[PDB]
PDB file of C-alpha atoms and ligand atoms in Angstrom:
ATOM      1  CA  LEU A   1      14.892 -73.690  11.109  1.00 40.04           C
ATOM      2  CA  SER A   2      18.025 -75.857  10.790  1.00 36.48           C
ATOM      3  CA  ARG A   3      21.105 -73.547  10.693  1.00 38.17           C
ATOM      4  CA  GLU A   4      19.996 -69.950  10.139  1.00 36.91           C
ATOM      5  CA  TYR A   5      22.259 -67.145   8.911  1.00 38.50           C
ATOM      6  CA  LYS A   6      21.486 -63.984  10.885  1.00 38.14           C
ATOM      7  CA  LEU A   7      21.908 -60.913   8.664  1.00 36.83           C
ATOM      8  CA  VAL A   8      21.574 -57.257   9.652  1.00 37.44           C
ATOM      9  CA  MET A   9      20.523 -54.363   7.421  1.00 39.18           C
ATOM     10  CA  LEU A  10      22.404 -51.227   8.479  1.00 36.31           C
ATOM     11  CA  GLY A  11      21.994 -47.753   7.054  1.00 36.55           C
ATOM     12  CA  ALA A  12      20.668 -44.270   7.603  1.00 35.06           C
ATOM     13  CA  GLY A  13      16.947 -43.602   7.686  1.00 36.39           C
ATOM     14  CA  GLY A  14      15.350 -43.329   4.264  1.00 37.68           C
ATOM     15  CA  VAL A  15      18.025 -45.129   2.231  1.00 38.67           C
ATOM     16  CA  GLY A  16      15.635 -47.974   1.386  1.00 35.86           C
ATOM     17  CA  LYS A  17      16.470 -50.761   3.863  1.00 38.27           C
ATOM     18  CA  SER A  18      12.832 -51.842   4.187  1.00 37.89           C
ATOM     19  CA  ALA A  19      12.205 -51.604   0.433  1.00 35.88           C
ATOM     20  CA  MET A  20      15.214 -53.804  -0.372  1.00 36.26           C
ATOM     21  CA  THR A  21      14.180 -56.312   2.303  1.00 37.31           C
ATOM     22  CA  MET A  22      10.552 -56.595   1.171  1.00 39.31           C
ATOM     23  CA  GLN A  23      11.702 -56.887  -2.451  1.00 38.06           C
ATOM     24  CA  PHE A  24      14.131 -59.669  -1.536  1.00 38.11           C
ATOM     25  CA  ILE A  25      11.675 -61.758   0.481  1.00 36.48           C
ATOM     26  CA  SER A  26       8.395 -61.040  -1.337  1.00 38.44           C
ATOM     27  CA  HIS A  27       9.103 -59.206  -4.646  1.00 40.50           C
ATOM     28  CA  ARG A  28       7.024 -56.252  -3.438  1.00 41.49           C
ATOM     29  CA  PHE A  29       8.014 -52.585  -3.443  1.00 39.25           C
ATOM     30  CA  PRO A  30       6.303 -51.269  -0.287  1.00 38.35           C
ATOM     31  CA  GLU A  31       3.699 -48.507  -0.457  1.00 38.40           C
ATOM     32  CA  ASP A  32       3.985 -46.202   2.581  1.00 39.00           C
ATOM     33  CA  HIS A  33       6.136 -48.480   4.726  1.00 39.41           C
ATOM     34  CA  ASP A  34       6.280 -47.152   8.288  1.00 41.08           C
ATOM     35  CA  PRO A  35       9.931 -46.072   8.779  1.00 41.84           C
ATOM     36  CA  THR A  36       9.787 -46.851  12.528  1.00 42.19           C
ATOM     37  CA  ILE A  37       9.090 -50.599  12.210  1.00 41.20           C
ATOM     38  CA  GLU A  38      12.078 -52.770  13.099  1.00 36.56           C
ATOM     39  CA  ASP A  39      11.615 -56.487  12.483  1.00 37.09           C
ATOM     40  CA  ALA A  40      13.336 -59.678  11.365  1.00 38.99           C
ATOM     41  CA  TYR A  41      12.289 -61.738   8.343  1.00 38.93           C
ATOM     42  CA  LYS A  42      12.976 -65.348   7.370  1.00 37.39           C
ATOM     43  CA  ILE A  43      13.634 -66.629   3.854  1.00 36.92           C
ATOM     44  CA  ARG A  44      15.164 -69.771   2.363  1.00 40.89           C
ATOM     45  CA  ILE A  45      17.244 -69.486  -0.823  1.00 40.39           C
ATOM     46  CA  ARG A  46      19.705 -71.458  -2.971  1.00 41.63           C
ATOM     47  CA  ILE A  47      23.214 -70.102  -3.608  1.00 43.64           C
ATOM     48  CA  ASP A  48      25.547 -72.228  -5.757  1.00 40.83           C
ATOM     49  CA  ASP A  49      23.165 -75.214  -5.652  1.00 40.19           C
ATOM     50  CA  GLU A  50      23.167 -75.167  -1.830  1.00 38.96           C
ATOM     51  CA  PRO A  51      20.237 -73.959   0.305  1.00 40.76           C
ATOM     52  CA  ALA A  52      20.529 -71.562   3.227  1.00 42.22           C
ATOM     53  CA  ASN A  53      18.001 -70.265   5.756  1.00 44.70           C
ATOM     54  CA  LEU A  54      18.334 -66.507   6.234  1.00 44.77           C
ATOM     55  CA  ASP A  55      17.149 -64.356   9.148  1.00 47.01           C
ATOM     56  CA  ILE A  56      17.383 -60.686   8.158  1.00 44.96           C
ATOM     57  CA  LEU A  57      16.989 -57.823  10.639  1.00 45.03           C
ATOM     58  CA  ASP A  58      15.585 -54.654   9.067  1.00 47.15           C
ATOM     59  CA  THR A  59      16.766 -52.017  11.531  1.00 47.87           C
ATOM     60  CA  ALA A  60      14.680 -48.886  12.078  1.00 46.00           C
ATOM     61  CA  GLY A  61      13.313 -46.601  14.766  1.00 45.03           C
ATOM     62  CA  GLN A  62      14.631 -43.638  16.721  1.00 42.35           C
ATOM     63  CA  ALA A  63      15.498 -45.514  19.921  1.00 41.61           C
ATOM     64  CA  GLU A  64      19.188 -45.717  20.772  1.00 39.48           C
ATOM     65  CA  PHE A  65      18.992 -49.408  21.737  1.00 41.19           C
ATOM     66  CA  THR A  66      16.597 -52.323  21.304  1.00 37.38           C
ATOM     67  CA  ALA A  67      16.718 -55.930  22.458  1.00 37.83           C
ATOM     68  CA  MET A  68      16.478 -57.045  18.822  1.00 41.01           C
ATOM     69  CA  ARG A  69      19.326 -54.854  17.571  1.00 44.34           C
ATOM     70  CA  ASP A  70      21.523 -55.739  20.561  1.00 46.62           C
ATOM     71  CA  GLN A  71      21.135 -59.463  19.851  1.00 45.35           C
ATOM     72  CA  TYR A  72      21.591 -59.275  16.073  1.00 45.09           C
ATOM     73  CA  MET A  73      24.562 -56.889  16.306  1.00 42.54           C
ATOM     74  CA  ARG A  74      26.347 -59.463  18.496  1.00 42.12           C
ATOM     75  CA  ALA A  75      25.204 -62.713  16.846  1.00 43.81           C
ATOM     76  CA  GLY A  76      24.894 -61.544  13.239  1.00 45.78           C
ATOM     77  CA  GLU A  77      27.100 -63.351  10.740  1.00 45.98           C
ATOM     78  CA  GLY A  78      26.888 -60.721   7.997  1.00 43.49           C
ATOM     79  CA  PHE A  79      26.057 -57.060   7.539  1.00 44.23           C
ATOM     80  CA  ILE A  80      24.520 -55.167   4.632  1.00 44.73           C
ATOM     81  CA  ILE A  81      25.604 -51.537   4.954  1.00 44.63           C
ATOM     82  CA  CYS A  82      23.299 -49.437   2.778  1.00 43.40           C
ATOM     83  CA  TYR A  83      23.378 -45.856   1.553  1.00 45.51           C
ATOM     84  CA  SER A  84      21.440 -43.923  -1.080  1.00 45.85           C
ATOM     85  CA  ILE A  85      23.278 -42.659  -4.159  1.00 45.71           C
ATOM     86  CA  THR A  86      21.156 -39.492  -3.882  1.00 46.86           C
ATOM     87  CA  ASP A  87      22.329 -38.725  -0.310  1.00 45.15           C
ATOM     88  CA  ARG A  88      26.053 -38.155   0.220  1.00 50.69           C
ATOM     89  CA  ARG A  89      25.536 -37.788   3.976  1.00 49.39           C
ATOM     90  CA  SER A  90      24.104 -41.314   4.147  1.00 46.11           C
ATOM     91  CA  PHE A  91      27.192 -42.411   2.196  1.00 43.96           C
ATOM     92  CA  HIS A  92      29.479 -40.909   4.845  1.00 44.26           C
ATOM     93  CA  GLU A  93      27.405 -42.558   7.597  1.00 46.36           C
ATOM     94  CA  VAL A  94      28.482 -45.903   6.100  1.00 47.08           C
ATOM     95  CA  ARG A  95      31.897 -45.336   7.690  1.00 46.38           C
ATOM     96  CA  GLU A  96      30.204 -44.782  11.056  1.00 43.35           C
ATOM     97  CA  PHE A  97      28.352 -48.101  10.768  1.00 43.42           C
ATOM     98  CA  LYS A  98      31.658 -49.861  10.094  1.00 45.65           C
ATOM     99  CA  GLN A  99      33.016 -48.288  13.286  1.00 47.63           C
ATOM    100  CA  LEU A 100      29.922 -49.424  15.198  1.00 49.93           C
ATOM    101  CA  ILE A 101      30.489 -53.021  14.077  1.00 47.92           C
ATOM    102  CA  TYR A 102      34.051 -52.992  15.409  1.00 50.35           C
ATOM    103  CA  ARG A 103      32.983 -51.447  18.718  1.00 52.13           C
ATOM    104  CA  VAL A 104      30.521 -54.314  19.224  1.00 50.85           C
ATOM    105  CA  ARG A 105      32.465 -57.217  17.716  1.00 53.38           C
ATOM    106  CA  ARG A 106      36.051 -56.011  18.366  1.00 53.49           C
ATOM    107  CA  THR A 107      37.005 -57.203  14.869  1.00 50.26           C
ATOM    108  CA  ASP A 108      36.994 -55.961  11.280  1.00 49.61           C
ATOM    109  CA  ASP A 109      36.624 -59.399   9.664  1.00 47.23           C
ATOM    110  CA  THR A 110      32.839 -59.793   9.863  1.00 48.07           C
ATOM    111  CA  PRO A 111      31.435 -60.371   6.347  1.00 51.45           C
ATOM    112  CA  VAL A 112      29.985 -57.172   4.889  1.00 49.48           C
ATOM    113  CA  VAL A 113      28.398 -56.047   1.618  1.00 50.10           C
ATOM    114  CA  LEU A 114      28.234 -52.349   0.711  1.00 48.36           C
ATOM    115  CA  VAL A 115      25.180 -51.203  -1.251  1.00 48.96           C
ATOM    116  CA  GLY A 116      24.271 -47.905  -2.870  1.00 49.48           C
ATOM    117  CA  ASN A 117      20.503 -47.975  -3.324  1.00 53.28           C
ATOM    118  CA  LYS A 118      18.104 -45.920  -5.490  1.00 51.89           C
ATOM    119  CA  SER A 119      20.219 -46.330  -8.636  1.00 54.43           C
ATOM    120  CA  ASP A 120      17.118 -45.520 -10.710  1.00 51.42           C
ATOM    121  CA  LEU A 121      17.162 -41.897  -9.470  1.00 48.92           C
ATOM    122  CA  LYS A 122      19.999 -41.188 -11.892  1.00 50.29           C
ATOM    123  CA  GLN A 123      19.343 -37.438 -12.085  1.00 48.90           C
ATOM    124  CA  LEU A 124      19.554 -37.076  -8.276  1.00 51.89           C
ATOM    125  CA  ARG A 125      22.850 -38.947  -7.853  1.00 55.00           C
ATOM    126  CA  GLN A 126      25.154 -37.393  -5.256  1.00 53.18           C
ATOM    127  CA  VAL A 127      27.735 -40.213  -5.019  1.00 53.81           C
ATOM    128  CA  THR A 128      29.497 -41.707  -8.022  1.00 52.76           C
ATOM    129  CA  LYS A 129      29.636 -45.455  -8.523  1.00 54.93           C
ATOM    130  CA  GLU A 130      33.436 -45.211  -8.422  1.00 56.38           C
ATOM    131  CA  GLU A 131      33.235 -43.700  -4.926  1.00 56.83           C
ATOM    132  CA  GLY A 132      31.281 -46.717  -3.693  1.00 55.13           C
ATOM    133  CA  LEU A 133      33.617 -49.148  -5.453  1.00 54.53           C
ATOM    134  CA  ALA A 134      36.590 -47.359  -3.881  1.00 56.36           C
ATOM    135  CA  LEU A 135      35.052 -47.478  -0.399  1.00 54.81           C
ATOM    136  CA  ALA A 136      34.310 -51.189  -0.822  1.00 52.45           C
ATOM    137  CA  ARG A 137      37.954 -51.731  -1.771  1.00 52.42           C
ATOM    138  CA  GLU A 138      38.784 -49.949   1.491  1.00 51.60           C
ATOM    139  CA  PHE A 139      36.543 -52.413   3.362  1.00 49.79           C
ATOM    140  CA  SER A 140      37.681 -55.447   1.305  1.00 47.77           C
ATOM    141  CA  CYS A 141      34.017 -56.232   0.643  1.00 48.09           C
ATOM    142  CA  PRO A 142      31.731 -56.645  -2.380  1.00 48.49           C
ATOM    143  CA  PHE A 143      29.874 -53.614  -3.715  1.00 45.40           C
ATOM    144  CA  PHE A 144      26.549 -53.207  -5.501  1.00 48.17           C
ATOM    145  CA  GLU A 145      24.363 -50.395  -6.760  1.00 48.87           C
ATOM    146  CA  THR A 146      20.741 -51.491  -6.460  1.00 48.54           C
ATOM    147  CA  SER A 147      17.213 -50.284  -7.170  1.00 50.79           C
ATOM    148  CA  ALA A 148      14.644 -51.454  -4.638  1.00 51.46           C
ATOM    149  CA  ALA A 149      11.992 -49.720  -6.764  1.00 53.38           C
ATOM    150  CA  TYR A 150      12.503 -52.093  -9.709  1.00 54.21           C
ATOM    151  CA  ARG A 151      14.435 -54.933  -7.992  1.00 54.37           C
ATOM    152  CA  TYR A 152      17.797 -54.363  -9.680  1.00 55.71           C
ATOM    153  CA  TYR A 153      20.608 -56.470  -8.156  1.00 53.73           C
ATOM    154  CA  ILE A 154      18.647 -57.166  -4.957  1.00 56.68           C
ATOM    155  CA  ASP A 155      19.344 -60.907  -5.126  1.00 58.22           C
ATOM    156  CA  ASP A 156      23.047 -60.363  -5.878  1.00 53.91           C
ATOM    157  CA  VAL A 157      23.527 -58.503  -2.592  1.00 50.86           C
ATOM    158  CA  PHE A 158      22.306 -61.251  -0.264  1.00 55.85           C
ATOM    159  CA  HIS A 159      23.889 -63.997  -2.385  1.00 55.24           C
ATOM    160  CA  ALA A 160      27.301 -62.315  -2.177  1.00 54.49           C
ATOM    161  CA  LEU A 161      27.079 -61.896   1.600  1.00 57.34           C
ATOM    162  CA  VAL A 162      26.153 -65.558   2.117  1.00 57.24           C
ATOM    163  CA  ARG A 163      29.029 -66.513  -0.188  1.00 59.33           C
ATOM    164  CA  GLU A 164      31.377 -64.504   2.042  1.00 58.03           C
ATOM    165  CA  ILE A 165      30.080 -66.146   5.225  1.00 63.30           C
ATOM    166  CA  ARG A 166      30.473 -69.593   3.657  1.00 65.47           C
ATOM    167  CA  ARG A 167      34.025 -68.912   2.458  1.00 66.36           C
ATOM    168  CA  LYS A 168      35.063 -67.511   5.844  1.00 69.01           C
ATOM    169  CA  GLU A 169      33.493 -70.547   7.528  1.00 67.11           C
ATOM    170  CA  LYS A 170      35.258 -73.109   5.326  1.00 63.86           C
ATOM    171  CA  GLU A 171      38.539 -71.326   6.074  1.00 62.95           C
ATOM    172  CA  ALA A 172      38.052 -71.768   9.826  1.00 62.87           C
ATOM    173  CA  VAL A 173      37.276 -75.475   9.358  1.00 61.28           C
ATOM    174  CA  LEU A 174      40.468 -75.983   7.343  1.00 61.51           C
ATOM    175  CA  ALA A 175      42.462 -74.074   9.961  1.00 60.08           C
ATOM    176  CA  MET A 176      40.971 -76.272  12.691  1.00 60.57           C
ATOM    177  CA  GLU A 177      42.055 -79.400  10.803  1.00 62.26           C
ATOM    178  CA  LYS A 178      45.701 -78.271  10.809  1.00 60.47           C
TER     179      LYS A 178
HETATM  180  N1  GDP B   1      13.211 -44.575  -6.610  1.00 60.80           N
HETATM  181  C1  GDP B   1      13.544 -45.378  -5.570  1.00 60.80           C
HETATM  182  N2  GDP B   1      12.979 -45.138  -4.358  1.00 60.80           N
HETATM  183  C2  GDP B   1      13.277 -45.907  -3.285  1.00 60.80           C
HETATM  184  C3  GDP B   1      14.228 -47.015  -3.450  1.00 60.80           C
HETATM  185  N3  GDP B   1      14.341 -47.607  -2.245  1.00 60.80           N
HETATM  186  C4  GDP B   1      13.535 -46.932  -1.383  1.00 60.80           C
HETATM  187  N4  GDP B   1      12.893 -45.926  -2.008  1.00 60.80           N
HETATM  188  C5  GDP B   1      11.949 -44.962  -1.391  1.00 60.80           C
HETATM  189  O1  GDP B   1      12.598 -44.299  -0.298  1.00 60.80           O
HETATM  190  C6  GDP B   1      11.680 -44.080   0.773  1.00 60.80           C
HETATM  191  C7  GDP B   1      12.254 -44.649   2.060  1.00 60.80           C
HETATM  192  O2  GDP B   1      12.515 -46.037   1.859  1.00 60.80           O
HETATM  193  P1  GDP B   1      12.563 -47.059   3.102  1.00 60.80           P
HETATM  194  O3  GDP B   1      12.553 -48.488   2.613  1.00 60.80           O
HETATM  195  O4  GDP B   1      11.430 -46.816   4.069  1.00 60.80           O
HETATM  196  O5  GDP B   1      14.003 -46.697   3.727  1.00 60.80           O
HETATM  197  P2  GDP B   1      14.476 -47.226   5.169  1.00 60.80           P
HETATM  198  O6  GDP B   1      14.053 -46.235   6.225  1.00 60.80           O
HETATM  199  O7  GDP B   1      15.979 -47.367   5.151  1.00 60.80           O
HETATM  200  O8  GDP B   1      13.860 -48.578   5.447  1.00 60.80           O
HETATM  201  C8  GDP B   1      10.398 -44.810   0.414  1.00 60.80           C
HETATM  202  O9  GDP B   1       9.392 -43.848   0.088  1.00 60.80           O
HETATM  203  C9  GDP B   1      10.724 -45.645  -0.808  1.00 60.80           C
HETATM  204  O10 GDP B   1       9.631 -45.639  -1.729  1.00 60.80           O
HETATM  205  C10 GDP B   1      14.803 -47.214  -4.802  1.00 60.80           C
HETATM  206  O11 GDP B   1      15.617 -48.136  -5.026  1.00 60.80           O
HETATM  207  N5  GDP B   1      14.422 -46.379  -5.779  1.00 60.80           N
HETATM  208 MG1   MG B   2      12.632 -48.964   7.050  1.00 61.87          MG
END
């Protein structure tokens, strides 16, 4: 499919990675989505009047390693690190996923978007929005609070990540010209 952008959904179990993915690609909030299913999904979109083919890996399962995860961790061009605003532990695990990316890629410069999901569960919030914003400033990455239940800011997440990949790519082309 022309030039695909491989994207990887990272996050603890139960933060809503599958819900956000299904909402992005099909506008459907899943009913009883099996939390053990890991799979990749294709979708074509337009950011800034330019189309892009996306290939998004929705990570899951209790196995330590899979052929799919191994390939996408190495070849992925962008990462969506997700936590739930109702689960502070999943918010701390975000830092562990950032470490995992460096251990695989041996770099910190891979495009990343940080997302706090389940924003609609306002009364169960365990992590403030300012804490996410501050952590994203630590990572030098965009931040969003989303609701996969009602599709709040789901498009903005994947658009921002593709924007980052494009900007980083155009920088390498300009550096190669000099
Ligand atoms: N209220 C609310 N519930 C959510 C949201 N995202 C996911 N969930 C629920 O959280 C549970 C686990 O979500 P899931 O997509 O399977 O998380 P995953 O294991 O990271 O893929 C499911 O029962 C979803 O209905 C959200 O944005 N708002
Ligand atoms: Mg899932």
